[PDB]
């Protein structure tokens, strides 16, 4: 349909891809760092969701420079995707409100 609604899905399909690639690179980067906990895929994937939503529970986090890096890409894509739906939900509501004014 429209741009706003397209981007939303795109951000969704992109968020998932980033979640998957993120959890994978997360483990790749953290293993080798003594005391690191973000080192197995299943929980790394969970950590990923935790990060994209900024729900921060502090149960798992990167302790390496590259992990931190991977983390920043995930927070950004997370905050952006979720901020891209909010913006799409605003357009949807703005256009409908326009219709309810014979404008």
């Amino acid at each position, epitope marked *: 349909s429209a741009l706003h609604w397209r981007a939303a899905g795109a951000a969704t399909v992109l968020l998932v891809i980033v979640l998957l690639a993120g959890s994978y690179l997360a483990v790749l980067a953290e293993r080798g760092a*003594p005391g690191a906990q973000l*080192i197995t895929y299943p929980r790394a994937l969970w950590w990923s969701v935790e990060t994209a939503t900024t729900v921060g529970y502090g149960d798992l986090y990167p302790v390496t420079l590259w992990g931190r890096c991977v983390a920043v890409v995930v927070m950004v894509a997370g905050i952006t995707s979720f901020g891209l739906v909010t913006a799409a939900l605003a357009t949807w509501f703005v256009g409908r409100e326009q219709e309810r004014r014979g404008h």
Partner: antibody
Amino acid sequence: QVQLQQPGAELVKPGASVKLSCKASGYTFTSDWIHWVKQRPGHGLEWIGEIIPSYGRANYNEKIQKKATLTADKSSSTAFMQLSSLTSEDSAVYYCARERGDGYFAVWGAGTTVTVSS
Amino acid sequence: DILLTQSPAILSVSPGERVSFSCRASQSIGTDIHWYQQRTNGSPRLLIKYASESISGIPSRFSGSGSGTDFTLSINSVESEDIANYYCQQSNRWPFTFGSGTKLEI
């Protein structure tokens, strides 16, 4: 049906070196890590290192004298552990196992017993 | 690095009794503790993963319990086939580590 295959033995002279191999079969992934475990006679298991065949990255047990180098061959599905400048201390059975990136060693090789002497 | 302790080293028992091996982590590692069996001239064999979860192909007499820094592998009525060395391993933090292992004797 026998996932990891290692040569039963390898004789090495002091100061020498050896390249052990671990050929795998069965379900193969990109997440799969190949681990190496050293076991001296009358001793328990000791983690040596790990390698992610895909990316090809490897990590080593920073607690012990580094004597290994890990590599792999995406093609033949074979992981290699290069042991160099061995001594008496280096003689033991070296197992290789497969970890599905979830923390435990599902399958182990029969281990290659490396004895060092002239 | 995480230290895993297995006491006692050796462990006796009368045929058919219930036996429990202990593995104490030097710090809280959740349930990320796994168990291996190793017989004379054998390779380690996974018995229990993640403390409780049993493996396919493993006798039902083997069970594992625990969380945090204390875990125990039990055997309901040990048989002779059970005579071997048992090791614990963690995977909670890098690098993975192994217990000193415990030997069962009937």
